[PDB]
Amino acid sequence: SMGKLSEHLRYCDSILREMLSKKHAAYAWPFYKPVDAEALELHDYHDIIKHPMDLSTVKRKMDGREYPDAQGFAADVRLMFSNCYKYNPPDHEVVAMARKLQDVFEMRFAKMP
Numbered sequence: 100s101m102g103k104l105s106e107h108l109r110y111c112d113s114i115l116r117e118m119l120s121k122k123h124a125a126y127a128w129p130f131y132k133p134v135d136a137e138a139l140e141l142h143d144y145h146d147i148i149k150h151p152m153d154l155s156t157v158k159r160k161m162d163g164r165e166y167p168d169a170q171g172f173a174a175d176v177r178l179m180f181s182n183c184y185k186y187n188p189p190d191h192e193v194v195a196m197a198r199k200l201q202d203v204f205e206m207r208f209a210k211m212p
């Protein structure tokens with residue numbers, strides 16, 4: 100009943116639910132939680148990536164309605180992908196996995212009424 104802004108935010112909630120769901124778990128799982136640079140022994144990760152982002156953080160912020168509009172939500176989802184492209188070798192499996200998940204994201208986002 101509140102119009103397009105409310106509807107866009109609800110649609111974004113749904114995109115996020117889909118990205119976190121079992122449907123995409125073959126490629127989305129590296130993006131469920133913040134990169135644990137200590138556990139992964141990535142001693143240069145936080146020197147290269149200045150603004151880490153991941154789907155659990157997007158969920159915390161979206162559920163708290165910290166994104167004022169759909170573009171703000173998209174910016175953080177795309178930051179997550181961009182961090183992966185920036186840090187990792189371009190032929191790495193994890194870059195292909197980020198790309199598979201971004202194909203889903205961009206498709207759903209483009210079809211937001």
Ligand SMILES: COc1cc(C(=O)NC2CCN(C)CC2)ccc1Nc1ncc2c(n1)N(C1CCCC1)CC(F)(F)C(=O)N2C
Pocket residue numbers: 129130134135139141144182183186187193
């Ligand atoms: C428990 O989680 C993992 C476990 C294993 C795992 O189980 N690895 C090995 C354990 C020991 N040997 C035997 C081989 C598998 C590998 C990766 C994991 N998780 C992860 N999450 C996120 C990123 C990532 N990884 N990336 C990968 C690239 C290659 C090494 C980290 C680089 C990155 F920079 F952090 C990045 O951008 N992303 C998005």
